């Protein structure tokens, strides 16, 4: 919405300021979207009149004659306008004036006699939207005075944005019935006289829809002239509110819509032929539209009709050829109401939006017609010829919107506000809002007004009491609670702890878009279909996640294209996998993911230049997962995935469950996206590693231990699964600890075979270990190692 200042000040005149009115309009419920100017900043433009026009002597531009401002001297002032006929009083720039736009008028030569202050059009003065030429200002005006005071340029256009709770204040009367109460100034309603009909009868109407149109009116006006000029005194009111003219009658019936909130435009009478009957349309009924499309309805759309093919949708779209053309003689009006539960979705159903449909959906003042149609016909017959017939009443007395008895008690008001507002003030707040107040003992009974469609329950009285009492006229107090501790748990983790660990190891945390590209989303997870998205933003973002490796490998190639390398990021979010035995069709897990790439050590003075690999990722990950969690049993095996290398990748288990995927991506995956340099990724399923173990003490010994070196020779087939793990299970009182410090694949070992240096620190829980019992437990592990087709080496 947008409306002007002085039009609002016709109804209530608060002597506050030119801008502190816009600060008290936003303390009532209407969020103002800026206060914009109306014109440029000049210093006076005086209006005069022209006499006895003439033609150009030598050039091709006419108007070589004088003007008459009203000074006692007569100065020759010329122009070149396309409409400067004789007897057209226009404002003009003079010597005591500056024209905005940094083009100050001078006295140079332009194709003939010089000009000494030119004519100001619309765009030549400070305002917008030229039509043809100079200002066609109406006559019978005193001269010498200023256009800045005369045409009322000292106001502004405020753009208010009403919320759907308030259906009344979409117009001047709705806003100024609210400012008057919120500042307690009295509101002067302009008195609206009746019409005193003079002429014969009217085409009769009848509504056969008693539940979706409680009222409907109209009037004939016979003998109008649609070629009449639009009055400027109403054009300047319609100008500031962003409303452009059509001819005259659409202006008159946009003015009454803006002024009173009541929607009405026009009917032609001779193109009716059979009466007006208002009813629902049959299935498959088709009407026309202005844009060139020919749309239909289903069964529900109310259509204004006759005993023939129908001609108008209910308060949403009127009609092209059923409207007034340039030869229409008689006109009928549509002052109608519609039940807002009955007209809801028919605007957005057919791709329609119109300012009358915007009002009929929320609501409209149901006691308004006998003022609205009479103001409209007054402004119609006062600017055109003709006269009006009698009113046309069709109304249903029982299906009107009725008002409840909203009883309020002192307990609810006190328990909901917190403050003590006196009954002497509450019984005045509701009366000045405009309700009928019957106050009793410790209670209030107040029925609703007609114009507001948001007062049916007790909160809708408490809110409207406190809104006019003021929110910042209530003091403060902290709450009163009971200090229940609330349960905790020691044997679990938090997210912030693992995130603070990732920051300790050197990882940025990013947050990406949670819906990604289906083109480079299927290149990571083929086979599993995606959750597509109707009505997207573009084709680039039209698919939910299936993992977290889409936005991350978008962020990496964002940063690497901005001449900035070695990006280490991670991100925790939740993914969307399609299923069938799930809650809503997709199962969702919280996921912790990441990306490492670039250089390892960042160019240090002794640390060499070696790019990162899988052992670094797994070592920096085992601290994340298996330190703050179990490390009880965690097995790394080889499980394939069509997004990464088969060898340099793993599948973390933690007691027989697929919990993770780690390792460098496929080396032909990086041919797309162009991720310069070798990257690595590591995903983890969160709420299965979200429980730690609470530790327990045990008796500790004192005696030292010794370091025994074993170098088992194995072929290059088993990595560590049956080498470093079966050593611990043999003997539960002698072997603790197992290390490795040097591989052996040089020249001494046989080809295709390897020796892993397996150091041990053997110790006993109650005594020490001497040279006799060590030879039992080193040989017993080798006796348990010959089931893996190898044994120890001879060196």
């Amino acid at each position: 919405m947008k409306f002007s200042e002085l039009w609002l000040r016709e109804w209530v005149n608060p002597a506050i300021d030119s801008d502190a009115l816009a600060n008290q309009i936003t303390m009532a419920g209407l969020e103002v979207d800026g206060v914009e100017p109306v014109a440029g900043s000049f210093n006076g433009v005086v209006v005069g009149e022209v006499v006895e026009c003439a033609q150009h002597p030598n050039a091709d531009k006419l108007r070589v004659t004088k003007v008459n401002v009203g000074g006692e001297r007569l100065l020759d002032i010329v122009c070149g306008a396309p409409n400067c006929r004789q007897g057209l009083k226009v404002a003009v720039a003079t010597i005591g004036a500056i024209l905005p736009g940094d083009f100050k008028i001078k006295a140079a030569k332009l194709r003939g006699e010089p000009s000494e202050g030119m004519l100001c059009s619309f765009s030549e003065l400070g305002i917008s939207d030229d039509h043809s030429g100079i200002i066609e200002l109406p006559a019978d005006a005193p001269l010498g005075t200023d256009i800045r005071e005369y045409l009322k340029l000292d106001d502004n256009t405020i753009e208010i944005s009403v919320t759907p709770n308030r259906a009344d204040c979409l117009g001047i009367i709705g806003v100024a019935r609210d400012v008057a109460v919120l500042n307690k100034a009295p509101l002067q309603e302009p008195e609206m006289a009746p019409v005193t009909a003079t002429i014969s009868d009217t085409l009769p109407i009848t509504v056969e829809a008693a539940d979706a149109c409680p009222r409907y009116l109209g009037r004939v006006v016979k003998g109008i002239n649609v070629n009449a000029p639009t009055p400027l005194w109403m054009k300047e009111k319609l100008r500031r509110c962003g409303i452009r003219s059509i001819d005259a009658v659409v202006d008159v019936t946009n003015y009454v819509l803006l002024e009173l909130g009541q929607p009405m435009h026009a009917f032609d009478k001779d193109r009716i032929d059979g009466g007006i009957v208002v009813r629902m349309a049959k299935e498959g009924e088709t009407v026309v539209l202005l844009d060139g499309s020919e749309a239909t309805l289903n069964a529900d759309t109310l259509v204004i009709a006759d005993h023939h093919k129908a001609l108008g949708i209910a308060g949403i779209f009127w009609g092209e050829h059923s409207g007034v053309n340039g030869e229409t003689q008689n006109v009928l009006l549509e002052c109608a109401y519609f039940n807002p539960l009955s007209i809801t979705g028919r605007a957005r159903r057919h791709g329609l939006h119109t300012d009358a449909s915007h009002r009929y959906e929320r609501g409209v003042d149901p006691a308004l017609q006998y003022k609205a149609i009479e103001r409209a016909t007054r402004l119609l017959l006062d600017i055109c010829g003709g006269d009006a017939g009698p009113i046309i009443d069709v109304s249903n007395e029982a299906t009107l919107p009725k008002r409840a008895t909203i009883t309020l008690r002192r307990s609810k008001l006190d328990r909901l506000i917190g403050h003590h507002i006196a009954d002497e003030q509450v019984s005045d707040i509701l009366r000045r809002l405009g309700c009928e107040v019957t106050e009793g003992q410790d209670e209030w009974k107040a029925v609703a007004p007609t114009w507001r469609f948001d007062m049916e329950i007790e909160e809708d009285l408490v809110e409207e009491v406190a809104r006019v009492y003021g929110y910042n006229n209530i003091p403060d107090e902290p709450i009163q609670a009971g200090l229940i501790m609330g349960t905790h748990r020691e044997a679990d983790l938090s997210l912030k702890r693992v995130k603070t660990m990732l920051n300790d190891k050197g990882y940025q945390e990013v947050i990406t878009y949670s819906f990604v590209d289906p083109k480079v989303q299927q290149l990571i997870h083929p086979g599993a279909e995606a959750l597509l998205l109707p009505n997207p933003i573009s084709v680039e973002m039209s698919a939910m996640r299936l993992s977290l490796w889409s936005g991350l490998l978008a962020t990496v190639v964002y940063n690497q294209n901005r001449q900035q390398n070695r990006v280490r990021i991670f991100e925790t979010g939740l993914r969307f996998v399609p299923d069938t035995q799930a809650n809503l069709g997709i199962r969702q897990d919280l996921m912790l993911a990441g990306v490492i790439c670039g250089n390892r050590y960042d160019e240090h003075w002794n640390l060499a230049k070696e790019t990162v690999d899988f052992y670094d990722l797994k070592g920096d990950l085992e601290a994340v997962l298996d330190l703050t969690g179990k490390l009880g049993d965690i097995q790394f095996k080889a499980e394939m995935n069509p997004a990464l290398h088969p060898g340099q990748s793993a599948a973390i288990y933690l007691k027989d469950e697929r919990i993770g995927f780690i390792g460098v991506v496929h080396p032909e995956l990086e041919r797309k996206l162009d991720l310069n340099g070798r990257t690595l990724v590591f995903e983890l399923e969160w709420n299965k590693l979200a429980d730690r173990i609470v530790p327990q003490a045990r008796e500790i010994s004192r005696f030292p231990a010794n370091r025994r070196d074993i170098a088992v020779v194995v072929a290059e087939n088993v990595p560590a699964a049956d080498i470093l793990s079966e050593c611990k299970k043999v003997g539960v009182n002698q072997v603790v600890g197992v290390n490795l410090f040097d591989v052996y694949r040089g020249k001494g070992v046989a080809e295709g075979y390897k020796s892993l240096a397996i150091s041990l620190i053997l110790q006993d829980t109650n005594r020490t270990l001497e040279e006799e019992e060590i030879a039992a437990t080193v040989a017993k592990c080798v006796e348990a190692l010959k089931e893996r087709f190898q044994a120890s080496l001879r060196d």
Partner: protein
């Protein structure tokens, strides 16, 4: 390259073996979080104190038999190592006023050495001062803290005791299983002579306080039985609390 350049998969990855806190440190921070989500904020101070901070402010008052049974570490006549962490809350109650609470962790010293008493052990003295709280609102908070520090395995019994700086007093004394009952903590409402020489009126105000031993709590919780092993600081004992 793809089916040839493979590596070993389950070798241990390179890192630095991270290390854990101390058990009394973990218990101090756990009870600090337990009381921080009720709004209690911590407070700290010095470890050396004159008599007017440690004894003559808690209404002892000096001829009482509490100046030899505390087993204090004296220096000359008006200096002593802090025997109970209460000067940190007296120096807070004196300055500001009067409806906020605090807790305080810290080190106390007592001249006792055996296989059951180190000369230093951490204590945790709470404090709360506001209008209209009583012994009901002491049981309903200490029962809640015990039920949250344990996991509802054990039973309590409020029995009477006597601390000079709080009267009427109590003792909470949770149920063990090896013996009959282990005494865990003690509490009580603040004596009005403690309030009156600070700047709070005991005719309208009230409050309580509580002091628990952190090493007995940690021993009973994580199963350790030798109290002297906490401060010899062996890594082979300390590595399991990580």
């Amino acid at each position: 390259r793809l089916a040839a350049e493979t590596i070993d998969i389950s070798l241990p990855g390179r890192r630095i073996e991270n290390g854990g806190l101390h058990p009394v440190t973990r218990t101090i921070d756990r009870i600090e979080s337990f009381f921080g989500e009720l709004g209690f904020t911590v407070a700290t101070g010095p470890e050396i104190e004159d008599d007017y901070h440690n004894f003559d402010a808690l209404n002892i008052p000096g001829h009482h038999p509490a100046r030899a049974d505390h087993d204090t570490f004296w220096f000359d006549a008006t200096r002593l190592l802090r025997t109970q962490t209460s000067g940190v809350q007296i120096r807070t109650m004196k300055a500001q006023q009067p409806p906020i609470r605090i807790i305080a962790p810290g080190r106390v010293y007592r001249n006792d050495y055996d296989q059951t008493h180190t000369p230093m052990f951490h204590q945790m003295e709470g404090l709360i001062v506001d209008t209209n709280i009583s012994f009901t609102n002491l049981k309903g908070t200490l029962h809640d803290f015990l039920r949250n520090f344990f996991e509802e395995d054990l039973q309590i019994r409020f029995r009477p005791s006597y601390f000079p700086f709080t009267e009427p007093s109590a003792e909470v004394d949770v149920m063990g299983k090896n013996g009959k009952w282990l005494e865990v903590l003690g509490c009580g409402m603040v004596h009005p002579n403690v309030l009156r020489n600070v700047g709070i009126d005991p005719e309208i105000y009230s409050g309580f306080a509580f002091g628990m031993g952190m090493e007995r709590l940690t021993m009973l919780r994580y199963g350790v039985t030798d109290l002297r092993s906490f401060f010899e600081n062996d890594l082979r004992f300390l590595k399991q609390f990580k």
